[PDB]
Symmetry: C5
Subunit: 253 residues, 5 copies
């Protein structure tokens, strides 16, 4: 497999046209305003730390590494590992899947404890119904890695409208120098630009690449659950592939 | 569990980066305007008192003690309770849980009136289907503690747009003094700043920390429902902890 | 069923903290603008009469009487009714309930014609499956009373933005007088204030006390639908109260 | 059966307060801008003609004839024809229901092809399973008549932001004339008013009169789906009327 | 079948009314701004590559060939193919469809492999149970081609508010020249016009002609799933079209 380069070139080339459109006009020393980086970056992170427990914000902020360097699941191997379990259950039975739990526990953590329940002797109606309520609450841990980045997309630009009115009321209070209305409005217009740079170029794409990586990795886990229901029913090994290549949209020769 | 310090440091360090950006430019004597605190705070909590019955607004406002000092339910004891109920039903039967009702009422009141129905001898199809509906209306109790703070977050800044114009119309009435437009536009802009200090830093984090505390305390309530369905069917103690450590994602040796 | 003063003191104390901030500014006659009360109120209510049929708007505006003077259903008599029907079914059977149909028809209209369908002898799969459809289409009588005040809350402020652009253009047409730019910008700024004082301080709380009046008066109907399915099956009276006190969070001594 | 006069006097009285408010301050010739009707009315009708197939827009833009002159289904006859079909069924069986299919096909096009299937002898589990799917995809014919006016309402004003900025950039590029900012800002402020007079007072009411004309025309269809299932099973004529007056909310003697 | 000329003539006629309003008040040499077509067109297309994997964005950005040149499925053949299978399945059995799969695979790729499962002998409780789940994941390939153009519809005008604020600050930094505010404010107001020209007249229709083209192509896929279930049960060819014309809304002679 390889790495999806869609998000690196998507944010590097979004911060490189925001950085060239500055160099095309003035310089890059006017747009650096340090006491207004903390009110949007340091403020939008801390005010969004209180919107979640401490454990769901430490994950959701350290979950960029699943946006930038994400590797899509090889679907031609999701099928092959189903026909590898299927033939194994018909060749050596179902009780001989215990020495291979750790092999499928490296494929994904849900196929590994769904075969452990298969060897322990639990009927499918209690495996397809416990591992379906475990997967729906495994993605609720992935929907909390997004709800952070859907909150930073809402708190970064809404903390610039704070860093502006804080830096705009201070200028109107004095207003005595007539040359303090020009530069005093630009410094108060940067804290908004940082709110629109980070929310649109950085925090919305990561809030979505974290969603298209959930709906894609849940879709593979929602296929293992349907095969295990058809693995223990003794279905033909060549039919659990054929019922998955159709289910995923993959061509098979 | 100790506590979730993700919201005390989340709302203080947001109100402490706001109070710095004010002290860096000037003094905070310019941003204190008392007759514009009683519209954003006094109004935003007055109109939001009318949006809910009185018993559902006194709860929603006093539901801050659940946002700030919240301690998440430890999933290592949500399991060691089901492993403690199951053996007490497998050893001494189901009718020997009368002496443990008030003790199983202390963990959570749902397991307390779900074993009381279990000892009376009501079939699982009712206790499983009543505690499913008793939870959905114990959930509408917590979704109103959040529906308040998602309404103050919509009325704190929307009573600033009223507190602005009420003080922005009088500035246009008497436009004789040329120096009455400077500070008059500053005072009429503070009542908008007070609306974004509260909606963004205080009312949205509490309208969410009360939601990530609902969805977590429901999953612990939802498992006790699924776990008792396995207790009246006479299952093993270790076959329900395994189906509940997988339904949560907890490690077991 | 005593009184809910949550909406009376919720709007009067919001129309006062507004009316105080206008009197503190110095004058109230500067905020009274008669040819702009007919465009925000006369427009927002007429342009929202066409968004509904005639009987869903006349009924939905006379539903402001259910926001102010609303009395929540006492959940200690929803229980003492179910324990009074089941105690009457176990004593006199079903056929001896003809003399009490009008008695329950005063509690709520659904229990009166859900016992009529019960006395007639219709199978429970048609009594429960119809009342679940009578109620599901009894909320569309209540979710319209909300959909009006949620359509007015979106048309009251967006019909003042028309009241502005009509008075903000007449001022820009005739700029010969420099004394018509100050007071002309205020009069065109009042119809924007009327748009936010009504929509956000009066028309949203009446749109939300009507939503918590539905969700609470449906929870009561959703029990009689269940408290009858358990009553015809010949269950004990003290069980249908125990299973209904738990679907409500009410204590039983 | 009369016609709903809730929209023909609801919008005509909305366009009569937006036109009286104009004639109070000045004249109407100041607001007539012909080369700006073609961006708001000519553009938002074209830019929303491309958002739908050519046949889903001719239906959606010709749905004003069903928003203005709509006559609500009288539920005092939906019940009388339900007890008329059953009394026609219990009298002469289900096969002799063919000499009236052309009579019930005139009531509504769904009761005509649901009785035509009732004569052909299809099982009642299928005449209801296709009709529930013939209806759920008969709303997608009605919800596409609504999705146009919920797309025009979002493209009438958002095409005023274009007609403004097109007429505001040409004024700034030619700011030599000092008297060109008085009328040049008014004429550029009308295309935003034409986008709020149509989207808010003409296309949002029709987008919500076609939604309340759907839910009241599906409620009658959805009752015929249940009244044909309770007729093949051979229920009394008096019960299918009693279960349908309670399913609609109509009083019976 | 033909080409839907609703988007190739309804967008071009909506890109001229945005272009004839420009040629009426001046020239286009004032609304052409090269260093600003790279922040909205070059930026919003790069900052929306990062929101999707590299394969789900190329699919959606190349899915305009489905908006402009789309061919509505002739529902008078969706019903004439069902009658072509049922008359061939009843005459020559189910097993004799092998010689005509590649024909039914060119109608649509879902009926071609749903018959391939029908010939292998899979029970309909796994064919319809797969082809209903193989269709729910055939939408996410179409629901992304929509989800891309609803993201460019929200990132084209969000990069205009960036291109403005970058072009509005470089003006306020250097405001010594009194003639540098006019032509400087117009150029900083074009980068916003370039956003609402594309996000409105180009990206909202393609995001909605891709949504009304999905609902029609998933409608035909859903009817095949409801016909094949009626084929394996061996229903008459005249009773599967009878339930497919009604399920589709088509007239049959």
């Amino acid at each position: 497999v390889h790495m999806d380069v869609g998000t690196i070139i998507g944010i590097i080339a979004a911060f490189l046209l925001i950085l060239i459109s500055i160099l095309i006009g003035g310089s890059i020393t006017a747009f650096i305003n340090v006491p207004s980086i903390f009110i949007v970056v340091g403020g939008g992170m801390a005010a969004a730390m209180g919107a979640f427990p401490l454990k769901d914000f430490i994950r959701g902020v350290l979950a960029i590494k699943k946006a930038f360097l994400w590797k899509p699941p090889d679907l031609n191997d999701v099928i092959e590992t189903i026909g590898e379990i299927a033939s194994k259950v018909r060749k050596e039975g179902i009780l001989a899947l215990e020495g291979d739990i750790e092999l499928y526990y490296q494929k994904d953590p849900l196929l590994g404890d769904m075969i452990r329940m298969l060897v322990d002797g639990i009927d499918i109606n209690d495996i397809k119904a416990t591992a379906e309520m475990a997967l729906a609450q495994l993605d609720e841990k992935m929907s909390t890695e997004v709800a952070v980045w859907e909150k930073l997309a809402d708190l970064f630009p809404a903390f610039g409208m704070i860093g502006t009115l804080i830096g705009l009321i201070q200028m109107l209070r004095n207003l005595n120098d007539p040359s303090a209305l020009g530069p005093g409005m630009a410094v108060a217009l940067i804290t908004t630009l940082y709110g629109a740079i980070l929310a649109n170029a950085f925090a919305i794409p990561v809030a979505n690449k974290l969603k298209k990586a959930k709906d894609m990795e849940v879709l593979v886990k929602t296929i293992y659950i349907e095969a295990i229901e058809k693995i223990q029913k003794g279905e033909n090994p060549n039919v659990v592939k054929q019922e998955a290549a159709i289910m995923l949209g993959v061509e098979l020769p």
